[PDB]
């Protein structure tokens, strides 16, 4: 079975983007990211708890964390469901990349439809940074843009 | 066992707003609307099919219609699930209103999480307008603002 969703990223900056998600059944979720206006380099890219955009990107809450674990890299055992790792922005400030993930379904109890995708200001340290923020946010800095994950055909 | 959702309405104009939704169980959904910058008068306010905002408010598709019926008023029998009727904008351009509805749940197959709320430019004619558009859009005109329905605490 095929389910699809999209997120339009906007924020208090010049960062804009589109993200599409698709999955079939218990399958993994394929994530296609295109974001422009980023500073060249690595950027944290996470799926956050809430699709609330009232008070800017902050209302989206923390990283989606159904298994109540600590922050990690996508390939780690111990990680938040929403830890998608880093996005690389090229010399033109554009990040295009396709990710695959197990922990962000489009159906079921752990569905991420109606939650948020956020692109961050700094590199995500994947938990291994030994900073106080390492085990919660990855020390990825402020929030550049976000969007609610909504349904598409 | 209470579910909650929110939608932040923006668009190609000067209309902005917040909408909050809540339901418990098979219960009705409560909708709290606050929209500013509207022209004084009646405005169509509908829940559309898709949370897609790629190409403005147009990507959100038509009125959410799981039962494949024609356009109607909220109290009719023959109506789209998304037909919430009209919103009244006072002399200052502000519409505050609390609606209750049966056909826009926050769980189950007919969930509206990840879909869109749209506020329209003209009065919704509730189907009884005998225009070609009367049975599909209510002839409510262009789309002033929309937002994706996302989860909150
Ligand atoms: Zn995390
Ligand atoms: Zn309708």
mmCIF file of C-alpha atoms and ligand atoms in Angstrom:
data_model
loop_
_atom_site.group_PDB
_atom_site.id
_atom_site.type_symbol
_atom_site.label_atom_id
_atom_site.label_comp_id
_atom_site.label_asym_id
_atom_site.label_seq_id
_atom_site.Cartn_x
_atom_site.Cartn_y
_atom_site.Cartn_z
ATOM 1 C CA UNK A 1 0.000 0.000 0.000
ATOM 2 C CA UNK A 2 1.170 3.529 -0.752
ATOM 3 C CA UNK A 3 0.870 6.584 1.496
ATOM 4 C CA UNK A 4 2.330 10.018 0.671
ATOM 5 C CA UNK A 5 2.882 13.263 2.565
ATOM 6 C CA UNK A 6 4.582 16.646 2.047
ATOM 7 C CA UNK A 7 5.972 19.423 4.224
ATOM 8 C CA UNK A 8 6.593 22.983 3.096
ATOM 9 C CA UNK A 9 9.447 24.495 5.157
ATOM 10 C CA UNK A 10 9.385 28.225 6.025
ATOM 11 C CA UNK A 11 10.840 30.319 8.841
ATOM 12 C CA UNK A 12 12.317 33.455 10.358
ATOM 13 C CA UNK A 13 15.064 33.595 7.764
ATOM 14 C CA UNK A 14 15.668 33.024 4.072
ATOM 15 C CA UNK A 15 15.528 29.278 4.260
ATOM 16 C CA UNK A 16 12.796 27.607 2.230
ATOM 17 C CA UNK A 17 12.140 24.065 1.177
ATOM 18 C CA UNK A 18 9.914 21.166 0.238
ATOM 19 C CA UNK A 19 10.050 17.667 1.687
ATOM 20 C CA UNK A 20 8.066 14.687 0.413
ATOM 21 C CA UNK A 21 7.531 11.418 2.330
ATOM 22 C CA UNK A 22 6.255 8.075 1.090
ATOM 23 C CA UNK A 23 5.910 4.552 2.396
ATOM 24 C CA UNK A 24 4.069 1.326 1.673
ATOM 25 C CA UNK A 25 2.790 -0.832 4.574
ATOM 26 C CA UNK A 26 5.143 -1.526 7.492
ATOM 27 C CA UNK A 27 7.838 -0.470 5.014
ATOM 28 C CA UNK A 28 10.514 2.175 5.495
ATOM 29 C CA UNK A 29 9.739 5.791 4.757
ATOM 30 C CA UNK A 30 11.470 7.519 1.872
ATOM 31 C CA UNK A 31 12.193 11.181 2.425
ATOM 32 C CA UNK A 32 13.058 13.575 -0.427
ATOM 33 C CA UNK A 33 14.475 16.853 0.746
ATOM 34 C CA UNK A 34 15.080 20.050 -1.169
ATOM 35 C CA UNK A 35 15.986 23.128 0.869
ATOM 36 C CA UNK A 36 17.519 26.423 -0.309
ATOM 37 C CA UNK A 37 19.096 29.414 1.447
ATOM 38 C CA UNK A 38 21.205 27.373 3.895
ATOM 39 C CA UNK A 39 24.770 28.251 4.895
ATOM 40 C CA UNK A 40 27.063 25.812 3.129
ATOM 41 C CA UNK A 41 27.898 22.840 5.336
ATOM 42 C CA UNK A 42 26.167 20.360 7.653
ATOM 43 C CA UNK A 43 22.745 21.026 9.131
ATOM 44 C CA UNK A 44 20.604 19.138 11.599
ATOM 45 C CA UNK A 45 17.344 17.888 10.110
ATOM 46 C CA UNK A 46 14.851 16.333 12.489
ATOM 47 C CA UNK A 47 11.203 15.390 12.728
ATOM 48 C CA UNK A 48 9.795 17.186 15.790
ATOM 49 C CA UNK A 49 6.863 16.222 18.025
ATOM 50 C CA UNK A 50 4.120 18.739 17.080
ATOM 51 C CA UNK A 51 2.658 20.347 13.976
ATOM 52 C CA UNK A 52 2.112 23.498 16.008
ATOM 53 C CA UNK A 53 3.523 26.591 14.284
ATOM 54 C CA UNK A 54 1.809 29.247 16.432
ATOM 55 C CA UNK A 55 4.912 30.597 18.169
ATOM 56 C CA UNK A 56 7.293 30.144 15.246
ATOM 57 C CA UNK A 57 9.363 26.991 14.868
ATOM 58 C CA UNK A 58 9.613 26.656 18.650
ATOM 59 C CA UNK A 59 6.060 25.404 19.116
ATOM 60 C CA UNK A 60 6.920 22.213 17.297
ATOM 61 C CA UNK A 61 8.409 20.891 20.526
ATOM 62 C CA UNK A 62 11.336 18.488 20.860
ATOM 63 C CA UNK A 63 12.442 15.655 18.590
ATOM 64 C CA UNK A 64 9.703 13.079 18.062
ATOM 65 C CA UNK A 65 10.428 10.495 20.718
ATOM 66 C CA UNK A 66 7.860 7.688 21.154
ATOM 67 C CA UNK A 67 10.422 5.292 22.701
ATOM 68 C CA UNK A 68 11.626 7.836 25.270
ATOM 69 C CA UNK A 69 15.328 7.459 24.375
ATOM 70 C CA UNK A 70 18.250 9.915 24.042
ATOM 71 C CA UNK A 71 19.488 11.714 20.906
ATOM 72 C CA UNK A 72 21.499 9.733 18.378
ATOM 73 C CA UNK A 73 22.439 9.311 14.712
ATOM 74 C CA UNK A 74 20.057 7.637 12.293
ATOM 75 C CA UNK A 75 22.046 4.430 12.281
ATOM 76 C CA UNK A 76 22.365 4.206 16.056
ATOM 77 C CA UNK A 77 20.390 1.829 18.214
ATOM 78 C CA UNK A 78 19.642 4.504 20.780
ATOM 79 C CA UNK A 79 17.986 7.499 19.077
ATOM 80 C CA UNK A 80 14.764 9.510 18.862
ATOM 81 C CA UNK A 81 12.390 8.389 16.118
ATOM 82 C CA UNK A 82 12.820 11.812 14.554
ATOM 83 C CA UNK A 83 16.644 11.732 14.319
ATOM 84 C CA UNK A 84 17.257 11.921 10.579
ATOM 85 C CA UNK A 85 20.817 13.132 11.027
ATOM 86 C CA UNK A 86 22.464 15.768 8.854
ATOM 87 C CA UNK A 87 21.617 17.429 5.575
ATOM 88 C CA UNK A 88 24.484 18.818 3.491
ATOM 89 C CA UNK A 89 24.164 22.224 1.868
ATOM 90 C CA UNK A 90 26.392 22.719 -1.173
ATOM 91 C CA UNK A 91 28.313 25.838 -2.162
ATOM 92 C CA UNK A 92 25.124 27.480 -3.438
ATOM 93 C CA UNK A 93 23.289 26.987 -0.189
ATOM 94 C CA UNK A 94 21.143 24.152 -1.490
ATOM 95 C CA UNK A 95 20.599 20.762 0.111
ATOM 96 C CA UNK A 96 19.162 17.971 -1.974
ATOM 97 C CA UNK A 97 19.187 14.436 -0.666
ATOM 98 C CA UNK A 98 17.085 11.328 -0.255
ATOM 99 C CA UNK A 99 16.908 9.557 3.117
ATOM 100 C CA UNK A 100 15.331 6.286 4.164
ATOM 101 C CA UNK A 101 14.095 5.622 7.714
ATOM 102 C CA UNK A 102 12.325 3.038 9.834
ATOM 103 C CA UNK A 103 10.962 5.095 12.694
ATOM 104 C CA UNK A 104 8.798 7.721 10.964
ATOM 105 C CA UNK A 105 5.735 5.821 9.575
ATOM 106 C CA UNK A 106 2.835 7.528 7.806
ATOM 107 C CA UNK A 107 0.252 5.290 9.580
ATOM 108 C CA UNK A 108 -0.259 3.618 12.863
ATOM 109 C CA UNK A 109 0.294 4.879 16.383
ATOM 110 C CA UNK A 110 3.669 6.349 15.570
ATOM 111 C CA UNK A 111 2.441 8.211 12.484
ATOM 112 C CA UNK A 112 4.227 11.465 11.763
ATOM 113 C CA UNK A 113 1.385 12.985 9.761
ATOM 114 C CA UNK A 114 0.569 16.264 11.489
ATOM 115 C CA UNK A 115 3.988 16.594 13.078
ATOM 116 C CA UNK A 116 6.785 18.891 11.912
ATOM 117 C CA UNK A 117 10.026 18.763 9.981
ATOM 118 C CA UNK A 118 12.641 21.257 11.086
ATOM 119 C CA UNK A 119 15.966 22.198 9.546
ATOM 120 C CA UNK A 120 18.475 23.533 12.062
ATOM 121 C CA UNK A 121 21.212 26.177 12.014
ATOM 122 C CA UNK A 122 24.261 24.074 13.006
ATOM 123 C CA UNK A 123 25.687 20.601 12.541
ATOM 124 C CA UNK A 124 23.949 17.836 14.487
ATOM 125 C CA UNK A 125 26.550 16.091 16.650
ATOM 126 C CA UNK A 126 24.632 12.805 16.644
ATOM 127 C CA UNK A 127 24.926 12.420 20.443
ATOM 128 C CA UNK A 128 28.687 11.894 20.425
ATOM 129 C CA UNK A 129 29.507 15.519 21.241
ATOM 130 C CA UNK A 130 29.648 15.243 25.010
ATOM 131 C CA UNK A 131 27.835 18.557 25.505
ATOM 132 C CA UNK A 132 24.826 19.011 27.727
ATOM 133 C CA UNK A 133 22.632 19.421 24.620
ATOM 134 C CA UNK A 134 24.165 16.404 22.899
ATOM 135 C CA UNK A 135 21.705 13.968 24.379
ATOM 136 C CA UNK A 136 18.627 16.065 23.674
ATOM 137 C CA UNK A 137 19.019 18.333 20.634
ATOM 138 C CA UNK A 138 22.396 17.315 19.189
ATOM 139 C CA UNK A 139 23.401 20.895 19.769
ATOM 140 C CA UNK A 140 22.141 21.770 16.348
ATOM 141 C CA UNK A 141 21.416 25.370 17.234
ATOM 142 C CA UNK A 142 18.395 27.459 16.343
ATOM 143 C CA UNK A 143 15.495 26.589 14.060
ATOM 144 C CA UNK A 144 15.818 27.913 10.467
ATOM 145 C CA UNK A 145 12.584 26.606 8.980
ATOM 146 C CA UNK A 146 9.785 24.111 9.563
ATOM 147 C CA UNK A 147 6.611 22.731 8.174
ATOM 148 C CA UNK A 148 3.718 20.531 9.120
ATOM 149 C CA UNK A 149 3.652 17.119 7.533
ATOM 150 C CA UNK A 150 0.452 16.967 5.489
ATOM 151 C CA UNK A 151 -1.289 14.462 3.182
ATOM 152 C CA UNK A 152 -0.929 14.436 -0.645
ATOM 153 C CA UNK A 153 -2.167 12.205 -3.502
ATOM 154 C CA UNK B 1 -8.538 10.329 25.977
ATOM 155 C CA UNK B 2 -8.562 13.842 24.408
ATOM 156 C CA UNK B 3 -6.959 14.628 21.007
ATOM 157 C CA UNK B 4 -5.941 18.144 19.980
ATOM 158 C CA UNK B 5 -4.822 19.823 16.763
ATOM 159 C CA UNK B 6 -4.034 23.287 15.456
ATOM 160 C CA UNK B 7 -3.829 25.078 12.092
ATOM 161 C CA UNK B 8 -2.041 28.323 11.304
ATOM 162 C CA UNK B 9 -3.707 30.119 8.398
ATOM 163 C CA UNK B 10 -1.603 32.198 5.979
ATOM 164 C CA UNK B 11 -1.850 33.126 2.325
ATOM 165 C CA UNK B 12 -1.407 35.461 -0.630
ATOM 166 C CA UNK B 13 -2.968 38.518 1.010
ATOM 167 C CA UNK B 14 -3.461 40.043 4.459
ATOM 168 C CA UNK B 15 -5.479 37.289 6.129
ATOM 169 C CA UNK B 16 -3.971 35.444 9.098
ATOM 170 C CA UNK B 17 -5.452 33.236 11.728
ATOM 171 C CA UNK B 18 -5.218 30.348 14.165
ATOM 172 C CA UNK B 19 -7.639 27.431 14.394
ATOM 173 C CA UNK B 20 -7.668 24.846 17.200
ATOM 174 C CA UNK B 21 -9.478 21.507 17.091
ATOM 175 C CA UNK B 22 -10.272 19.058 19.862
ATOM 176 C CA UNK B 23 -12.302 15.857 20.261
ATOM 177 C CA UNK B 24 -12.616 12.981 22.749
ATOM 178 C CA UNK B 25 -13.337 9.493 21.312
ATOM 179 C CA UNK B 26 -16.131 9.122 18.713
ATOM 180 C CA UNK B 27 -17.217 12.527 20.010
ATOM 181 C CA UNK B 28 -17.881 15.675 17.934
ATOM 182 C CA UNK B 29 -14.845 17.914 17.133
ATOM 183 C CA UNK B 30 -14.789 21.406 18.661
ATOM 184 C CA UNK B 31 -13.347 24.045 16.360
ATOM 185 C CA UNK B 32 -12.119 27.438 17.709
ATOM 186 C CA UNK B 33 -11.509 29.982 14.963
ATOM 187 C CA UNK B 34 -9.744 33.325 15.128
ATOM 188 C CA UNK B 35 -8.993 34.954 11.770
ATOM 189 C CA UNK B 36 -7.967 38.586 11.125
ATOM 190 C CA UNK B 37 -7.795 40.846 8.048
ATOM 191 C CA UNK B 38 -10.988 39.610 6.409
ATOM 192 C CA UNK B 39 -13.455 41.916 4.622
ATOM 193 C CA UNK B 40 -16.427 42.427 6.913
ATOM 194 C CA UNK B 41 -19.201 39.943 6.091
ATOM 195 C CA UNK B 42 -19.705 36.215 5.524
ATOM 196 C CA UNK B 43 -16.874 33.946 4.427
ATOM 197 C CA UNK B 44 -16.707 30.326 3.426
ATOM 198 C CA UNK B 45 -14.677 28.181 5.807
ATOM 199 C CA UNK B 46 -14.026 24.606 4.757
ATOM 200 C CA UNK B 47 -11.755 21.665 5.542
ATOM 201 C CA UNK B 48 -10.047 20.706 2.269
ATOM 202 C CA UNK B 49 -8.684 17.297 1.204
ATOM 203 C CA UNK B 50 -4.907 17.759 1.262
ATOM 204 C CA UNK B 51 -2.274 19.325 3.552
ATOM 205 C CA UNK B 52 -0.347 20.240 0.427
ATOM 206 C CA UNK B 53 0.654 23.929 0.302
ATOM 207 C CA UNK B 54 3.279 23.634 -2.458
ATOM 208 C CA UNK B 55 1.401 25.741 -5.008
ATOM 209 C CA UNK B 56 -0.268 28.127 -2.573
ATOM 210 C CA UNK B 57 -3.722 27.337 -1.227
ATOM 211 C CA UNK B 58 -4.736 25.639 -4.475
ATOM 212 C CA UNK B 59 -2.802 22.438 -3.742
ATOM 213 C CA UNK B 60 -5.085 21.657 -0.892
ATOM 214 C CA UNK B 61 -7.593 20.284 -3.363
ATOM 215 C CA UNK B 62 -11.381 20.235 -2.974
ATOM 216 C CA UNK B 63 -13.571 20.002 0.089
ATOM 217 C CA UNK B 64 -12.825 16.889 2.130
ATOM 218 C CA UNK B 65 -15.412 14.404 0.863
ATOM 219 C CA UNK B 66 -15.119 10.798 2.163
ATOM 220 C CA UNK B 67 -18.798 10.034 1.442
ATOM 221 C CA UNK B 68 -18.708 11.326 -2.125
ATOM 222 C CA UNK B 69 -21.702 13.687 -1.735
ATOM 223 C CA UNK B 70 -22.475 17.219 -2.947
ATOM 224 C CA UNK B 71 -21.863 20.583 -1.251
ATOM 225 C CA UNK B 72 -24.207 21.609 1.545
ATOM 226 C CA UNK B 73 -24.506 23.484 4.847
ATOM 227 C CA UNK B 74 -23.213 22.031 8.105
ATOM 228 C CA UNK B 75 -26.700 21.102 9.268
ATOM 229 C CA UNK B 76 -27.743 19.414 6.036
ATOM 230 C CA UNK B 77 -27.632 15.668 5.474
ATOM 231 C CA UNK B 78 -26.137 15.899 2.003
ATOM 232 C CA UNK B 79 -22.814 17.667 2.531
ATOM 233 C CA UNK B 80 -19.075 17.214 2.266
ATOM 234 C CA UNK B 81 -17.379 16.230 5.551
ATOM 235 C CA UNK B 82 -15.460 19.460 5.180
ATOM 236 C CA UNK B 83 -18.470 21.764 4.976
ATOM 237 C CA UNK B 84 -18.212 23.957 8.098
ATOM 238 C CA UNK B 85 -20.326 26.724 6.592
ATOM 239 C CA UNK B 86 -19.733 30.434 7.060
ATOM 240 C CA UNK B 87 -17.531 32.465 9.354
ATOM 241 C CA UNK B 88 -18.632 36.035 10.176
ATOM 242 C CA UNK B 89 -16.073 38.841 9.997
ATOM 243 C CA UNK B 90 -17.007 41.821 12.189
ATOM 244 C CA UNK B 91 -16.523 45.485 11.290
ATOM 245 C CA UNK B 92 -12.817 45.281 12.212
ATOM 246 C CA UNK B 93 -12.231 42.370 9.870
ATOM 247 C CA UNK B 94 -12.046 39.783 12.596
ATOM 248 C CA UNK B 95 -13.817 36.495 12.816
ATOM 249 C CA UNK B 96 -13.993 34.679 16.115
ATOM 250 C CA UNK B 97 -16.254 31.700 16.381
ATOM 251 C CA UNK B 98 -16.596 28.268 17.936
ATOM 252 C CA UNK B 99 -18.093 25.506 15.768
ATOM 253 C CA UNK B 100 -18.961 21.906 16.597
ATOM 254 C CA UNK B 101 -18.960 19.165 13.937
ATOM 255 C CA UNK B 102 -19.484 15.409 13.502
ATOM 256 C CA UNK B 103 -17.668 14.707 10.280
ATOM 257 C CA UNK B 104 -14.110 15.920 10.942
ATOM 258 C CA UNK B 105 -12.631 13.491 13.509
ATOM 259 C CA UNK B 106 -9.045 13.624 14.735
ATOM 260 C CA UNK B 107 -8.641 9.798 14.542
ATOM 261 C CA UNK B 108 -9.800 6.881 12.462
ATOM 262 C CA UNK B 109 -10.084 6.541 8.688
ATOM 263 C CA UNK B 110 -11.695 9.917 8.296
ATOM 264 C CA UNK B 111 -9.072 11.780 10.347
ATOM 265 C CA UNK B 112 -8.411 15.355 9.238
ATOM 266 C CA UNK B 113 -4.954 15.546 10.755
ATOM 267 C CA UNK B 114 -2.650 16.421 7.869
ATOM 268 C CA UNK B 115 -5.368 18.004 5.827
ATOM 269 C CA UNK B 116 -6.026 21.728 5.359
ATOM 270 C CA UNK B 117 -8.359 24.428 6.649
ATOM 271 C CA UNK B 118 -9.077 27.213 4.137
ATOM 272 C CA UNK B 119 -10.894 30.509 4.585
ATOM 273 C CA UNK B 120 -12.496 31.803 1.394
ATOM 274 C CA UNK B 121 -13.047 35.245 -0.169
ATOM 275 C CA UNK B 122 -16.873 35.175 -0.565
ATOM 276 C CA UNK B 123 -19.998 33.911 1.140
ATOM 277 C CA UNK B 124 -20.586 30.163 0.916
ATOM 278 C CA UNK B 125 -24.049 29.595 -0.585
ATOM 279 C CA UNK B 126 -24.512 26.254 1.209
ATOM 280 C CA UNK B 127 -25.607 24.478 -2.007
ATOM 281 C CA UNK B 128 -28.888 26.357 -2.351
ATOM 282 C CA UNK B 129 -27.501 28.944 -4.795
ATOM 283 C CA UNK B 130 -28.423 27.166 -8.020
ATOM 284 C CA UNK B 131 -25.086 28.061 -9.624
ATOM 285 C CA UNK B 132 -22.840 25.566 -11.361
ATOM 286 C CA UNK B 133 -20.384 25.931 -8.465
ATOM 287 C CA UNK B 134 -23.109 25.594 -5.853
ATOM 288 C CA UNK B 135 -22.819 21.819 -5.632
ATOM 289 C CA UNK B 136 -19.020 21.662 -5.487
ATOM 290 C CA UNK B 137 -17.499 24.794 -3.882
ATOM 291 C CA UNK B 138 -20.528 26.794 -2.698
ATOM 292 C CA UNK B 139 -19.222 29.510 -5.007
ATOM 293 C CA UNK B 140 -17.106 30.864 -2.185
ATOM 294 C CA UNK B 141 -14.568 32.403 -4.450
ATOM 295 C CA UNK B 142 -10.779 32.455 -4.171
ATOM 296 C CA UNK B 143 -8.652 31.155 -1.287
ATOM 297 C CA UNK B 144 -7.512 33.799 1.209
ATOM 298 C CA UNK B 145 -5.529 31.688 3.620
ATOM 299 C CA UNK B 146 -4.941 28.072 4.664
ATOM 300 C CA UNK B 147 -2.949 25.897 7.010
ATOM 301 C CA UNK B 148 -2.196 22.257 7.618
ATOM 302 C CA UNK B 149 -3.935 20.648 10.559
ATOM 303 C CA UNK B 150 -1.166 19.539 12.911
ATOM 304 C CA UNK B 151 -0.922 17.814 16.261
ATOM 305 C CA UNK B 152 -0.527 19.696 19.600
ATOM 306 C CA UNK B 153 -0.422 18.768 23.295
HETATM 307 ZN ZN1 LIG C 1 17.012 13.745 18.571
HETATM 308 ZN ZN1 LIG C 2 -18.320 21.449 0.344
#
